[PDB]
Ligand SMILES: C[C@@H](CS)C(=O)NCc1ccccc1
Ligand SMILES: [Zn+2]
């Protein structure tokens with residue numbers, strides 16, 4: 736079951752995987768939830784996405800200390816919006832190595848974000864160049880193409896049935912693709928489908944703005960994105 740921990744919510748998804756959820760008021764849209772992941776890989780912890788704020792991200796680290804009690808080796812963030820990168824300074828203050836798409840780091844200042852310490856680059860087929868993602872353990876990082884943003888990346892967790900679409904993917908009952916202010920509307924559908932094709936064995940799809948779902952999240956997202964073209 737969900738665990739409320741201060742103003743955040745944590746949910747175990749697999750033996751070594753938890754979802755973190757944090758909230759920010761968007762005046763005129765309500766208090767918007769954003770999800771990321773926490774993964775235990777042996778004697779260390781890996782984080783996917785910050786919370787919206789530094790204070791909330793420090794709370795994620797406090798939860799990790801209490802519930803796992805192992806060092807956080809690294810964090811990877813999935814694009815340069817506040818829900819994914821707003822807590823970078825808290826990660827740095829904690830001594831955690833941080834990674835983002837090179838393009839996310841380039842965009843960070845203009846988006847009001849602090850850049851990660853390290854830049855990921857990607858092969859033409861979308862897989863991360865392995866030298867740029869050292870010690871990522873089970874995290875398999877894939878650039879699916881431009882969609883929710885130009886820089887959006889996705890992460891599969893090897894040895895589990897889980898893949899994380901970030902803000903690219905919405906659940907199978909969603910009415911819309913949310914805010915498309917920075918979206919590539921022409922390429923969105925193809926990028927959603929490329930995410931699915933990169934992680935064909937993932938049966939649990941985790942995403943930023945919906946609860947975990949089946950692969951129908953991918954097909955439904957792509958079908959909605961077909962309407963943007
Ligand atoms: C939840 C957040 C980040 S995905 C969101 O939807 N922000 C609004 C927004 C998104 C893109 C461009 C301008 C404004
Ligand atoms: Zn976003």
Ligand SMILES: [Zn+2]
Nearest residue numbers: 816818902943
């Ligand atoms: Zn988002």
